[PDB]
Amino acid sequence: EPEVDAETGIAVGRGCADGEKYQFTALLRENRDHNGAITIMGKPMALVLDNKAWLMEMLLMPFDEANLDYRDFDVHIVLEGHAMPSIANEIAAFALRMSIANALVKLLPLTRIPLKKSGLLSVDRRRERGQFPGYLDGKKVKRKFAKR
Amino acid sequence: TATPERFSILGTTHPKPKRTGFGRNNKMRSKPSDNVAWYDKGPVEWLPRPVRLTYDHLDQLRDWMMRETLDGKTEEFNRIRDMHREWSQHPLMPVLGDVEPKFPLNLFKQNHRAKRRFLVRWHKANTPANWLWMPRGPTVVTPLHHTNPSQYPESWRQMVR
Amino acid sequence: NNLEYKRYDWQGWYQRMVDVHNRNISLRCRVSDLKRLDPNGVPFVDMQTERRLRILAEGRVGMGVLMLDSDKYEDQKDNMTFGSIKLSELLSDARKAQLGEEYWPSVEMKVRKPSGQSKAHYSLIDYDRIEKKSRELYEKYRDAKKKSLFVTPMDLWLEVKGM
Amino acid sequence: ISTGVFDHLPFQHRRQHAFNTLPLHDANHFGGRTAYLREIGPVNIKKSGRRFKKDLRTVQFNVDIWCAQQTLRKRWKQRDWEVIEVPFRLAPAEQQRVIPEMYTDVPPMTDPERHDFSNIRNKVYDREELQGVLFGASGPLPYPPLQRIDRQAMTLDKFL
Amino acid sequence: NASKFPHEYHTPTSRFPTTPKEKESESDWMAYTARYLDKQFTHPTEPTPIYNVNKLWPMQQVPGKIDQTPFEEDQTWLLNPIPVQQLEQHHPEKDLQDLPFVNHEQFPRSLEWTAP
Amino acid sequence: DRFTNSLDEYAPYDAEKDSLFHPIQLGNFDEYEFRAFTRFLVNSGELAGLGWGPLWHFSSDFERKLYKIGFLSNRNPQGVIDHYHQELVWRYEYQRTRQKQYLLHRNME
Amino acid sequence: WAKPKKRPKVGQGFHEKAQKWRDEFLLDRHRILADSLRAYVEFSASKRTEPWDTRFRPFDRVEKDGVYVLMRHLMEDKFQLCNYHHRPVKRLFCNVGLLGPQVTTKARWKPYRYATNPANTSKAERIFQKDKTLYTHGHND
Amino acid sequence: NTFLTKSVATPPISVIRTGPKWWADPERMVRQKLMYFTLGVDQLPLRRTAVIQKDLHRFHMCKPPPRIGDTTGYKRSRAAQLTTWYRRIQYQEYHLQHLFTRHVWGLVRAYPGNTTKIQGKADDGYVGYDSVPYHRYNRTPLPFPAREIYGRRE
Amino acid sequence: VRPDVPEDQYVDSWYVCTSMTHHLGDYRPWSASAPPNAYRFRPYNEFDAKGREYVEYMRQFARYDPRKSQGKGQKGFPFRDAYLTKMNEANRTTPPPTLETIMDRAVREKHQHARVLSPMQVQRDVGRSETPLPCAGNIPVDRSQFPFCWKTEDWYEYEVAKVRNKRFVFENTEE
Amino acid sequence: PHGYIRHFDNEVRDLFQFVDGVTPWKQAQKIRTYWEVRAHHPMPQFNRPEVAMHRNTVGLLPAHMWETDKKTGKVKAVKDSVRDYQTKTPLPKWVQL
Amino acid sequence: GVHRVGYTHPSTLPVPCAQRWDLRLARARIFQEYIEEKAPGAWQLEDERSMSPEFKTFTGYPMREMRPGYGQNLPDFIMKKRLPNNTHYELFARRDIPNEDNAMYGKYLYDMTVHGTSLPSTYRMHKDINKAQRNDRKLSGNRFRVLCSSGAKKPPSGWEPIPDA
Amino acid sequence: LKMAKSAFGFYLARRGQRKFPFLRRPHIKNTHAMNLSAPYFWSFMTAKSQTYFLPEENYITGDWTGKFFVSKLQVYTLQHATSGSTVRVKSFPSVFELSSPSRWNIGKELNTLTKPRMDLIDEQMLTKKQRLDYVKAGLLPK
Amino acid sequence: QSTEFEKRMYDIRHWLHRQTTCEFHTIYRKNVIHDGSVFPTEHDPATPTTHDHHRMFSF
RNA sequence: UAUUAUAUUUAUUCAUAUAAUUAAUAGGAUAAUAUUUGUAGUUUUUGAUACCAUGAUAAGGAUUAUAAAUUGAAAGUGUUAAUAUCAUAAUCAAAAUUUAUUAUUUAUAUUAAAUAUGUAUGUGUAGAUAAAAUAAGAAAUUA
């Protein structure tokens, strides 16, 4: 069913990457005036995501898989994880796209099926190797082993 | 003060012999390495050093382009275009049975350095002078680029009948 | 404490350590509840006085309330009297704004630097004298061009002490 | 939002100079500031080498101070205004109320009832309009009054 | 001869950036051209509000003290004599806990404790 | 850094308070001028070969390449001129693989 | 954990052989410090050679025009005074004011060790053969 | 061009294997495509490689196609010829990019890194401000300051 | 490996790599941790974990009063994004629809005799008729309200003021 | 008071008073600075290489206490100055014992 | 720019108004604030990692002084420095002794109250039991190490010890 | 550790080439002291602000019967050359008397003057193994 | 404020459970008088308290 | 056979310990009274020590798996609970490298706070060696 903020016209969909370091939410709003605009952390998306195409096309993709028009929606992408100076990264954009996908499933449900099928509502169950002192970089490499 | 003109025991100490070789264990000699570059084979040395183009350079190039383009000049343009038509023709499909030889296993330990050393020392010898897998020369026909620096549009007073 | 430091030799000095750690006494006040009338018939603190108070106190106020944290004395009653005194004293200070405008605290105005409409006149200021010394320096320059390869303004209107 | 590199890189094995790899403290990291943490040559670990250019936390503190320097550069560059201590009587009306101090109340609105919720912490006034206030009685106005742009005026902007 | 050697004698109060010794009238561009370029310029200095310019904002600074403002060009910090924090890193409160890894605490109080 | 040759200025401006001139407002492209200008780009870069050429069965049609350009720019003129260029790395396009599947599905029947 | 062996006795008279050894060691330090301060302060007061690099603008312009004419016509005395040392050179450049910020952003300066050779050197072996007994932290000729 | 110290020589195979990290670095493929669209050249090779690596990235999170237990074994050297055509495409492209940059640097009159041959100006590599007073590859003593390459009018 | 039951019933044991329940094995099923017939056992069948909080933020802003916010801690602090989009300057103007889009919707409605619908109105459904339509099918567009645009000193002063005014709570009001 | 020094206002006036009541100038006299003793180095002053490295002079170099061989330009040895070292102010002019 | 910090009286202006440095002085009077005068104007750095919310560790308060010339050596530091009186160092001191019962009472007092006698340590009574038994089955391995020997080397008027066998 | 140079080698393990926090060491082995730092002479291994009072092996704080040796923490001053007295530093192995006084020493501590790690090593303390080892690292010939 | 209830609250300090303790935060409204003779709101003095009167240990 | 891939990448200059006495209880104001203000029997035993003086918790990948799941184990690595009968060795500053079981900062800008490493420019350069399929992106010869 659609769970849309009745008075406000927004869908509030969650998304995450690395489960900790990136955790966004899409406030996706219906736009009856064809004035396309995508927003991230309160700023225009091009200036957030550094005008990089392979990073903002993923953020467009949900509207493609739903065959819908990005010009009739308004989207703010809110950061709730490890805030950083720059989030122009593939992991971050994947979090954004999952958040948007749940926003659109929540605004128009029957768009779930293309989103399910395309795997936009898919959670990569992945994280780094945690911080460990037994590893020289903390993540993967064990210190030099030497036989007598 | 009055620095004594004879030294008793400090100056007499055993001389720590300077490190003979360089590098790891100060033993890596002074002889050619895998890293040496070649200036006799190609406009790009092989193996090349990594270059990195910046947006400063993209803008400097764009401005140079405005100048050499509005000064009527097209000669370095046609030089660009010819050095492009030299190396940008589609190289033929490799013959079925032609493959980069991996380093053969079961000689060195898996983590050894000689494995990557042979790879670099063969990828060095496979210079642009050894690129026999692409069409280059006066034997190549180019059905996709322009044959003569006269078909370039800056000399467009030539094709007129 | 009521687990373990309740009862023996360490009970005493642990009670000391506890109550000293907690010795802080926070005093919050409502500046709107300073907006009262002194029984003299004068409003105790008017808008200008509130301005002087908020400007006397950098970080002690917030959300329309002023906070002072009596952190001085180990005993909470003595933090109480100390904070009461400091509060009363910052009040006596901020109250000078009921003595005249000479104590009304100034405003901070982000007065913009001179804009372009008024920066454009900065080339024609003294245009007459500058163009006159242009017409004269030009003759000295036409002279000089036979003396040196380049005529810098150092020999025209730029001046330095030789030593 | 900043595509700069804020963090000093983890002190790890020697990043070489190839594709995707620079010197850990080359000339391009922090605009050449890694000169203050760089040492040259395959340092003798026991005898040579400054003990504070091997740690991670102190080098990262230096780098943090340098990032703060940068923020301060750009912030104070961003000023075309100066703070002129006008008395209470003369300041234009938007600066005549109880403006709570910095980080005290929400960054206050200029005025709600007049359709301007503009940052009064970020409201900038021009000399050529505050002229009547500061140096009103100083003879000829050192700047001229502002020339305005008329938007009802029928010019090329109104398709004529 | 204390000032003849700038970096030897630093009080436990001395602080940076160490302000330079002032010339005559370096104030603004109007006074600069008036005394330094066009000695016969018409205007004495940029006509100044008789009020207070808190140039050094918001840092309230001692009047009668010749001070700089926080710089603009990202060059002067590279080209100042400012050092980097070489020895240990102290804060007068954190220094009780002696490091991050051994961060001490007197009582097991919550880190989100809202003190009364 | 796409703004190295930008000027370290940061400083504000106001068209009215900072000029004797009359402001002529050249706002962003409508999708109109965006579409005309972009058709010119995307097809004359072909007619001179400066773009996709004999690899044209990989980057999408005009009505989706333009949808992508106008998204990634927000109809902005510069965003358009540079997302007609960053078109190289558009790594989420399926028009051509869905059409190739239609051809290798129907050209059987 | 094997019981750590006691360090054997130091020996006979060695307490005094170390006395005399360290004695003449600080004795030798006397002269080493003397000569090293000599070399460092001559390094300091010696007019150095160019700190910038002539491989970049605006210091790639000809040695006749542009920032070079500004260098000859405002600062030509100051640089010879302050001994061309890259630190005062770059600060006089910062205070010349008619170049802006460029004295970092566009100007390319020699590395710290290519910068501190005296005026008018023409070898590459100078920095790599400077004396290694003057403990100047490399602050000698 | 800032980085003028020494660099590490890596073969194309491993410069390409870095895959979508730097080889198919999208923002680097783009920034080298900008050199081509400035100079006015067709980007046939870089676009071919971009197509290949867009495929490889789209089909990296997926499993290979199943092999059959053939004693006659044809799939093996067929996929081998496939890969090594992709590899040869990318070797050509590597060389094209390097050539265009080392030529555009002689055109912008910008200096390349150390011992980075630019056949536009000098038949040998650019040696200057090096950690060694000998030529890194010719063992020729360096001049002070760095050797000069282009004209002096800028 | 342990009953499917609201995880707050288990406690992680000490010293034992297991997990035991604070009530000694006495269980209450998922449906005791939810309202009756709660959809996905939601607290209120309306929205999920982030839908609730943000419907609430938008509501608190719609009822926000500044003369009421005083003397309250970070709770009287209005919506960070809403207050900021209200605060912005260039958001005071709402850009109109592109004239080509008006001509386009009009060639559809006047010329082509079919009505264009908002995405909340287009029946994406296949079999059953999506009637009634979403009542949001008529919301306005405020660049001053949503999208969330704001400036950076707004963001910073807002968040650091929120942070510093954590303690300035006059918990004893006269409400 | 507890916490910082900045809360001990009575005790600190008290500490000044006690410390002056016990500590005589006939004891606090001799206490040297570092510079009042570093004065008698053959090079008491040399500018750090940071800033006033351009302000270092030759005249600071006590060549009157070491010697030079001109064939290479090195200073070879140091004369005994601890012999002829005659100071007119062994402790500065403010010191009365 | 190199600007002279100037401050004009509330009397010179043709409108008097309380000036901000005088307000600073009133505040450093009320709350006994030291006014450091060597404070240069070009060093108004804030700790972005702590003051700027574009990092994972935004704190809002400047969690440290961005000032490399720092150390406890300085009096400006020593002024604003929490002293170890009544800190965890004291708590550790007054409760972390090797045996915890010796922090709640005295061992003899506890023994003479709950039992009668003052009992040895478990370790001592181990030694004493082993004495009791390894001097039961065998003898002639002991030693006589005492604190005071005057009474052993010099027994009382009687006390002629027994020779064993 | 292995060969107990002190009685605390009997008590403290090694932990290999254990990496330590910057400037946190249970044993202050000032192995860098005699480091000539030419323009940094009154700074390297010295007190920080030039205008400091002396350290405290420089004043008899009470009514002593005497001492056997001073520390290196007492600066060298005019009384250390002219008085020509006995000033001893507990260096390896027993003590080191500054009996050849000079004036260049005046101003610093004696740390820059007492060599921590000697270039002459007595094989009289080394083992039958350590001697071959110091040959290995290049200290003693063989 | 009802001191009797507070009396009933304080002795939960004893019937609390095992290994569980209690810190009581009390925020109670008070009355602090500001007063004329002792804390005067007089004019500024004639002699101005400059920065010298607030130096280190001037407190 | 199937229930399915290691031949790739990044790596190697490695060091820190010191100046002997561990044997016990002893309540203080706002409490209806202790000078208990100031509570005085010396010298009959001996292990955790410089010395034999049992035990008990680590490092180490090679075939229980794919879905709603983690790529770290018991075989015990210094300090620990019953064998006695050479000797006081224990951080309160300033300290003495022989110890296999270690990831160093690489040429635009180089000493300011408890002091804080002055050596090793050299064709990335012998031999043997290190790590890793985990948010990065790897693909084909089972016992």
Vertex C66: Cα angle to C62 and C70 (nearest 5): 120
Q: In whole angstroms, what is the distance from residue D146 CA to residue D128 CA?
A: 6
- For K:73-102, CB contacts with E below 8 A are 73-78, 80-82, 84, 87-89, 91
Question: Residue G87: in which H helix or E strand, if any?
Answer: helix G86-96
- Greatest CA separation for chain C: 106
SS3 J74: strand
d(CA L12, CA L28): 15
User: Taking each helix axis from N to C terminus, what angle separates H75-108 and B55-70, rounded to the nearest 10 degrees?
Assistant: 60
Token output for G85: 């040392």
Report the C-alpha gap between M6 and M28 in whole angstroms: 12
Q: Which residue of E has its CA nearest to J56?
A: E5
Q: A14 pairs with which residues across the strands?
A: A25
When CB atoms are compared, the residue of K42, K74, K81 closest to E70 is K42
Which stretches does DSSP call E strand in chain I? Answer: 10-12, 19-21
- Give the 3-state secondary structure of residue C42: coil
Q: Hunting for tokens 């009365």 — which residue is that?
A: J96
User: Would you call F86 and A44 a contact, using CB atoms and an 8 Å cutoff?
Assistant: no
Closest-approach residue (CA) in chain I for M25: I171
The chains found to touch B (3+ Cβ pairs under 8 angstroms) are D, F, G, H, J, L
Q: Which of A58, A68, A54, A43 shows the shortest CA–CA distance to A97? A: A58
Residue of B nearest to D17 (CA): B50
CA atoms within 13 A on the CB side of E19: 21
- Asked if D38 and D25 count as a contact pair (C-beta separation under 8 A), the reply is yes
- What whole-number distance in Å separates Cα of residue J46 and Cα of residue L107? 14
Rounded Cα distance, L14 and K61, in Å = 42
Other Cβ atoms less than 10 A from the Cβ of A80: the count is 14
Structure tokens at G101: 């910020």
Q: Judge contact between B61 and H39, C-beta under 8 A.
A: yes
What's the alpha-carbon Rg for chain E, to the nearest Å? Answer: 23
Categorise residue L23: left if φ over 0, alpha if ψ from -120 to 50, beta otherwise: left
β pairing state of C25-30 and C65-70? antiparallel
- In a 13 Å sphere around the CA of H51, the CA atoms on its Cβ side amount to 19
- E87 vs L: CB within 8 A: yes
Cα I42 to Cα A26, F105, J65: the distances in Å are 20, 46, 91
Q: How far apart are CA L80 and CA J40, in angstroms?
A: 12
* Minimum CA–C1' distance nucleotide for G52: N108
Q: Alpha-carbon distance E80 to G90, whole Å?
A: 10
Chain breaks after residues in chain B, where C lies over 2.5 Å from next N: none
Would you state the torsion angle of the CA atoms of residues E23, E70, D7, D42, taken in this order, to the nearest 10 degrees?
Answer: 10
d(C-alpha E106, C-alpha D52), whole Å: 31
Contact between G129 and H133 (Cβ < 8 Å)? no
* Kind and range of the H or E run holding H98: helix H75-108
Residue whose pair of structure tokens reads 């025991």 in the numeric block: B9
Task: Name beta bridge partners: L88.
Answer: L97
Dist CA D107 CA E11 (whole Å): 40
Q: Is C109:D125 a contact under the CB 8 Å cutoff?
A: yes
d(CA L77, CA J32): 10
Residue L87 contacts residue L95 (beta carbons within 8 Å): no
Exposed/middle/buried for residue J56 (C-beta within 10 Å: 0-12, 13-18, 19+): buried
**Are D26 and H8 an interchain contact pair (Cβ–Cβ within 8 Å)?**
no
Q: Which residue of chain M comes nearest to J16, CA vs CA?
A: M57
Closest CA to F56 of F95, F82, F14: F95
| C-alpha span between M9 and L137 (Å, rounded) | 75
Per residue, what are the HEC states of chain D? CCCCCCCCCCCCCCCCCECCECCCCCCCCCCCHHHHCCCCCCCCCCCCCCHHHCCCHHHHHHHHHHHHHHHHHHHHHCCCEEEEEECCCCCCHHHCCCCCCCCCCCCCEEECCCCEEEECCCCCEECCCCCCCCCCCCCCCCCCCCCCCCCCCCCHHHCC
Which nucleotide comes closest to L9 if you measure CA to C1'?
N17
Beta carbons within 8 Å of I20's beta carbon, 6+ residues apart: I10, I11, I13
Strand partners, I19: I12
Alpha helices for chain K (secondary structure H)? 20-30, 48-51, 75-79, 88-95, 101-104, 107-114, 122-134, 150-153
* Total Cβ atoms within 10 A of residue F2: 15
Residues G100 and E73 sit within 8 Å (Cβ to Cβ)? yes
The Å distance, CA of C3 to C1' of N57, is: 30
State the Cα–Cα distance between residues K89 and I162, nearest whole angstrom. 34
CA within 13 Å, CB half, A27: 25
Kindly tell me the number of DSSP H helices and DSSP E strands found in chain G.
Answer: 7, 1
CB of E91 within 8 A of CB of K64? yes
Of F30, F83, I100, the C-alpha closest to A60 is: F83
C-alpha distances out from residue F33 to F40, F76, F86, I57, Å: 11, 10, 20, 40
- DSSP-derived letter for residue B22 is B
Closest residue to C120, CB basis, from F14, F17, F20: F20
Is residue C88 less than 8 Å (CB to CB) from chain M?
yes
d(CA C57, CA D144) in angstroms, rounded, equals 39
DSSP K73: T
- H helices of chain C, where? 9-21, 47-56, 76-94, 116-119, 127-144
Separation between the CA of D39 and the C1’ of N76 (whole angstroms): 45
Cis omega (within 30 of 0) for bond into B48: no
CA distance M16 to chain K (A): 23
How many helices (H) does chain H have, and how many strands (E)? 4, 0
Largest CA distance in chain K: 118
Torsion of CA E40, E46, E50, E52, to 10 degrees: -140
- Beta-carbon pairs below 8 A across chains B and D: 4
CA nearest to L115, candidates H31, G99, G21, I11: G21
Residue L128's identity, in one-letter code, is: K
- Tokens, residue C132: 């006159």
Question: Residue B48 gets which letter from DSSP?
Answer: P
Closest nucleotide to residue G2 (Cα to C1')? N78
Pair D68, K66: CB distance under 8 Å: yes
Q: Residue H115: name the closest of I13, E5, B47, C102 by CA.
A: B47
Q: Which amino acid makes up residue J68?
A: T
In angstroms, the Cα distances linking L101 to C55, H103, L78, L94 are: 63, 68, 10, 20
Residue G118, SS3? strand
With CA atoms as reference, the chain G residue closest to J77 would be G31
* Alpha-carbon gap, residue D74 to M40, rounded angstroms: 46
Whether K60 and I156 lie within 8 Å, measured CB to CB: no
Nearest to K6 by CA among K19, K18, K15: K19
Report the C-alpha dihedral over residues L74, L78, L83, L84, rounded to 10 degrees: 70
Q: Which of D68, D72, D90 sits opposite K15 (nearest CB)?
A: D90
User: Does F20 sit within 8 Å of C115, measured CB to CB?
Assistant: no
β-pairing, C61-62 vs C65-70, is antiparallel
CA distance C59 to J42: 54
Q: What does each C-alpha distance from K138 to K130, K146, K152, M57 come to in angstroms? A: 12, 22, 23, 76
Which residues face L22 on adjacent strands? none
Q: What is the C-alpha separation between L11 and L4, in angstroms, rounded?
A: 9
Dihedral Cα D133, D137, D142, D146, nearest 10 deg: 40
Is any Cβ of chain D less than 8 angstroms from the Cβ of G113?
yes
Long-range CB pairs of F48-54, under 8 A, 24+ apart, other chains included: F49/H42, F50/H37, F50/H40, F50/H42, F50/H43, F51/H43, F52/H47, F53/H42, F53/H44, F54/B144, F54/H44
Query: How many angstroms separate the CA atoms of B115 and B94, rounded?
Result: 25
Handedness of CA F85, F88, F90, F93 (dihedral sign): positive
Give yes or no for a contact between G74 and H93, defined as CB atoms under 8 angstroms apart.
no
Query: Straight-line distance from CA A148 to C1' N100, in Å?
Result: 7
A4-14: b (≥16 Cβ within 10 Å) or e: bbeebbbbbbb
**Paired strand residues for G52:** G109
Q: Name every residue whose Cβ is closer than 8 Å to that of residue G85 and which is 6 or more positions away in sequence.
A: G44, G48, G51, G116, J53, J54
Neighbours of chain C (3+ CB pairs under 8 A): D, E, F, G, I, J, K, M
Cis, peptide link before residue L93, omega less than 30° from 0: yes
Q: By the 8 A CB rule, do G68 and G76 touch?
A: no
**CA–CA distance, B33 with B35 (Å, rounded to integer):** 5
What's the rounded Cα separation, in Å, for the pair H142 and G123?
Answer: 7
Q: φ and ψ at G109, to 5 degrees?
A: -110, 150
Sheet with E52-53, side-by-side order of all strands: D125-126, C107-112, D81-86, E52-53
By the 10 Å C-beta count (0-12 exposed, 13-18 middle, 19+ buried), C88 is classed as: middle
Q: How far is it, in rounded angstroms, from Cα L63 to Cα L55?
A: 18
What is the distance between the alpha carbons of residues C153 and C147, in angstroms, rounded to a whole number?
14
Q: How far apart are CA I147 and CA G62, in angstroms?
A: 54
Instruction: Give the H or E element holding residue H78.
Output: helix H75-108
Beta-carbon contacts of residue D34 (< 8 Å; ≥ 6 apart): D25, D26, D27
Length A143 CA → N73 C1' (Å): 20
CB of F24 within 8 Å of a chain D CB? The answer is yes
Sign of CA dihedral L66, L71, L73, L74: positive
* Nucleotide closest to L116 measured between CA and C1': N96
Q: Report the distance from CA of residue D58 to the C1' of nucleotide N109 in Å, as an integer.
A: 20
Q: In what order do the strands lie in the sheet with C25-30?
A: C25-30, C65-70, C61-62
Residues facing residue E66 across a β-bridge: K4
C45 chain-D contacts, CB cut-off 8 A: none
Site from I164, I168, I169 to mutate, C interface, most C CB atoms within 10 angstroms: I168
- Alpha-carbon distance of L140 to B14, in angstroms, equals 6
Q: From which experimental method does this structure derive?
A: cryo-EM
How many other CB atoms sit within 10 Å of the CB of residue B108?
14
Question: In 3D, which of E20, K10, H110, I149 has the Cα closest to residue A74?
Answer: I149
Report d(CA G20, CA L96) in Å as an integer: 9
What's the reported resolution, in angstroms, to a tenth? 3.5
CA distance K155 to K152: 5
Give me the count of residues in chain M. 59
Distance linking the first and last C-alpha atoms of chain B: 99
Cβ distance F5 to B54 less than 8 Å, yes or no, reads no
